[PDB]
Design a binder for these strands. Structure first.
Lengths: 38, 61, 141, 550
RNA sequence: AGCCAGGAUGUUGGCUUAGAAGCAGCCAUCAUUUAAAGAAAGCGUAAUAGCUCACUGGUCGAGUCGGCCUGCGCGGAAGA
């Protein structure tokens, strides 16, 4: 995944969750769309 | 160094030739001739008279 | 009106009757013949005519040859030999380029006894009027 | 016996891939790790293997179960064999079993026609299905007689079959030379007619030479059997002969000095730049092919007609690769191995017009020549066109030849890198002269100046070579095939299907086109092949302009 | 929002098209039949593609969508 200060939904299948206390992007269709540290 | 006699020869870098004794008093430091029709050397295209020099086969008549 | 299993469309005319250059090998490469193609092909192609672009069915199962019941030509195939240009576009909207009409391609649209949506032959009338305007023509309708 | 070893799976392919009509001839007892015995349908007998050393075998009847599975496949076999012998057809429908002898005749009379392909099996490492495959041999494998006669040509010129009669003219082909330490040069040959004889005399028409065959020889899997003759259809090696290289046709020493066919045409696919370091090695290399080109005419050597460097024609990576070991080792030559150069071209964009002056008046052979021209670019693929545009004759008649040989000339070293400035039209529309000073030559310079500058001025452009290529590929791989080609500075042109495959045409730069074999065979796991032709020259993307300033 | 459904006609769309049949490219972005289906949404075939979409039916049954003004917080935050 990419880890970075501005996390965004990229494709329409990114979802933005927050877990523990950390904004992340999940994306069913795009491993590359995975994100952290938002 | 060596003369390539005749009109038109298909010789180049790397061509293995054979060469005989025969200077060319006109070009300096040319004391040998290239034996046309020998190893890589070609007979001369189209020749008719004096073929044996210049390496050319009696044209299928 | 059933499901998937056998159909290609990739020709040059009823003129050329099985060529290998602009098509050829994969004119039949699964259950169809690079050779069969003036047989079920020219089962009527040269009875009537060889001079208009038209593909056709393949209907494939496992019975030697095929049952591709054949049929119609496109609608800019009759913008070369019935309406206008032999290639066409050029600079398509840089001006009016070419120009057709209403008469121009009525009985030319009007023939097909096999394809078109609706008994209203005023509706499937202007149904083909834009295959000529997919190139950028003028409407002398 | 190896994991995944599924017999059917093959046949489920031998008709799915190539698509022939194979015929199950056996059914294995114990798929893979449980490899025990095997069964031959045709003869409904069962054999077994107790080990893998190839000793404890035996023909033990079917083991309880299985059995049933057989029948049906032994029926289809006979049902198959039916499409050959009507006798094994009726007897089928009537309820009689074809004789184990007429049954074989069908299969055999059927294979030999390239209609069917008898499939067998067995772990060759564990010695299984081998002794049964060997029967499979004779039983279905053609004899030198069941095969169609070789064609050859008389000294006059006319085709003609070569009959396998060990009493007609002597006609044999050669196919493999080998240096034996004990008997020397060996020339394995396949006879077709007549019969070669130990201690005779032959004649190779190919290289019009009288060879003296002294000893005949047959290679036994473990010793040198010295026989006395090879009758048509038989194979072995002769000892003697010196001028007989590959593909040579040897006839009697009086027989019709004929030459068989042999014509095989496997050209190349991959080449490399080979620069023999200091002129020293440039020689070791000459000898390199002087013997390597006889020991393998499956390649070609060429001196790039434009830049010394020599090309090494191969037939696949590995090929040239392993030559690079021997040619560098068993020849100790140590040169360079990079890639070919590209035959670029110079030219211009904008038309220009400049003065061509020369004059040197000090006191005698004045040297006075001067001309003005009209330089104008021409379509990429125009050529060379000059214009004798002189009115009354301000530039004498006798000097124009030379003012051209000057312009024509200068165009040799481009204004950018030094390449054949081409694709332009030139117009001589002016220029004066002197009664005494002018010279045929003085003009050849002036004109060679007018040009030497119009190109410098009309904004030059480094043109390059574009090729025509046609990759034959199953539209299975196609998808990426086209891609890869796009990401190669190339622009696609079409794909009109062929056979089960499909052809792709398009242009590309010879620079971004090197070692394409091992890239095409990549996007196609082997099912890919291409050709290539020249076409035209065309500008470099500017970014490649300052690139070439080398 | 799920879910069960449909996803078309000129049109395989004319086209500097080697092959395109929506797709870097072609231009415009019009044009037939329907419940409604884009000369175009997609991961993307050797091309026919197989498979999901924007858009429409059924199901279900009361809420749902996201701009603005403001409070407190969250990530962005590594040193001997």
């Amino acid at each position: 995944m990419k880890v970075r200060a501005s996390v965004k939904k990229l494709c329409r299948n990114c979802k933005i969750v927050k877990r523990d206390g950390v904004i992340r992007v999940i994306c069913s269709a795009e491993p590359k769309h995975k994100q952290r540290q938002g | 160094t060596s003369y390539i006699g005749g009109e038109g020869h298909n010789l180049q870098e790397h061509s293995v030739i054979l060469i005989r004794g025969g200077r060319v008093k006109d070009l300096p430091g040319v004391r040998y001739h290239t034996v046309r029709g020998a190893l890589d050397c070609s007979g001369v295209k189209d020749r008719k008279q004096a073929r044996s020099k210049y390496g050319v086969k009696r044209p299928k008549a | 009106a059933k499901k998937v299993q056998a159909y290609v469309k990739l020709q040059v005319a009823a003129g050329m009757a099985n060529p290998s250059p602009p098509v050829g090998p994969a004119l039949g490469q699964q259950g169809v013949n690079i050779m069969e193609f003036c047989k079920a092909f020219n089962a009527k192609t040269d009875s009537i005519e060889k001079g208009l672009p038209i593909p056709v069915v393949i209907t494939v199962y496992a019975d030697r040859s095929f049952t591709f019941v054949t049929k119609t030509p496109p609608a800019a195939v009759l913008l070369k030999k019935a309406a206008g240009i032999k290639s066409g576009s050029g600079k398509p909207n840089k001006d009016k380029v070419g120009k057709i009409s209403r008469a121009q391609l009525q009985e030319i649209a009007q023939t097909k006894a096999a394809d078109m949506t609706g008994a209203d032959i005023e509706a499937m009338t202007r149904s083909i009027e834009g295959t000529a305007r997919s190139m950028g023509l003028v409407v002398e309708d | 016996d190896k994991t995944g070893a599924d017999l059917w799976l093959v046949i489920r392919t031998m008709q799915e891939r190539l698509g022939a009509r194979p015929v199950v001839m056996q059914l294995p007892i114990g798929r893979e790790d449980t490899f025990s015995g095997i069964i031959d349908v045709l003869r409904m007998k069962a054999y077994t293997y107790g080990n893998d050393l190839g000793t404890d075998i035996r023909e033990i009847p079917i083991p309880e179960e299985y059995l049933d599975q057989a029948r049906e496949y032994h029926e289809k076999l006979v049902e198959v064999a039916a499409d050959f012998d009507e006798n094994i057809m009726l007897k089928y429908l009537e309820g009689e079993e074809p004789t184990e002898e007429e049954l074989v005749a069908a299969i055999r009379k059927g294979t030999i026609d390239l209609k069917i392909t008898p499939v067998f099996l067995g772990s060759a490492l564990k010695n299984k299905g081998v002794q049964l495959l060997l029967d499979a041999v004779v039983d279905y494998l053609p004899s030198p007689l069941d095969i169609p006669p070789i064609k050859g040509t008389t000294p006059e010129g006319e085709v003609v079959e070569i009959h396998p009669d060990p009493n007609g003219p002597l006609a044999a082909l050669a196919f493999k030379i080998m240096a034996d330490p004990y008997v020397g040069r060996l020339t394995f040959i396949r006879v077709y007619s007549g019969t070669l004889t130990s201690g005779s005399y032959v004649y190779n028409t190919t290289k019009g030479r009288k060879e003296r065959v002294a000893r005949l020889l047959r290679m036994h899997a473990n010793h040198r059997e010295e026989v006395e003759e090879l009758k048509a259809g038989d194979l072995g090696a002769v000892v003697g002969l010196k001028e007989t290289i590959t593909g040579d046709t040897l006839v009697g020493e009086d027989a019709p000095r004929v030459i068989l066919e042999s014509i095989e045409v496997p050209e190349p696919v991959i080449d490399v730049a080979i620069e023999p370091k200091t002129k020293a090695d440039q020689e070791k290399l000459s000898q390199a092919l002087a013997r390597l080109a006889e020991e393998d005419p499956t390649f070609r050597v060429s001196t790039h007609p434009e830049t010394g460097q020599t090309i090494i024609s191969g037939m696949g990576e590995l090929h040239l690769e392993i030559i690079v070991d021997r040619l560098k080792r068993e020849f100790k030559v140590d040169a360079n191995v990079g890639k070919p150069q590209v035959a670029y071209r110079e030219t211009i964009t904008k038309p220009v017009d400049v003065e061509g002056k020369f004059i040197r008046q000090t006191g005698g052979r004045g040297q006075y020549g001067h001309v003005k021209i009209k330089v104008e670019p021409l379509p990429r693929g125009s050529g060379f066109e000059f214009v004798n545009a002189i009115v009354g004759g301000v530039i004498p008649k006798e000097y124009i030849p030379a003012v051209q040989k000057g312009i024509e000339e200068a165009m040799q070293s481009g204004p950018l890198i030094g390449f054949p400035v081409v694709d332009i039209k030139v117009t001589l529309y002016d220029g004066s002269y002197h009664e005494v000073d002018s010279s045929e030559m003085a003009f050849k310079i002036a004109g060679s100046m007018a040009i030497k500058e119009a190109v410098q001025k009309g904004d030059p452009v480094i043109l390059e070579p574009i090729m025509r290529v046609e990759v034959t590929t199953p539209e299975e791989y196609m998808g990426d095939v086209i891609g890869d080609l796009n990401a190669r500075r190339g622009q696609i042109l079409g794909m009109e299907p062929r056979g089960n495959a499909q052809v792709i045409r398009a242009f590309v730069p010879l620079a971004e086109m090197f070692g394409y074999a091992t890239d095409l065979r990549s996007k196609t796991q082997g099912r890919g092949s291409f050709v290539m032709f020249f076409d035209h020259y065309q500008e470099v993307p500017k970014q490649v302009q300052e690139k070439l300033i080398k």
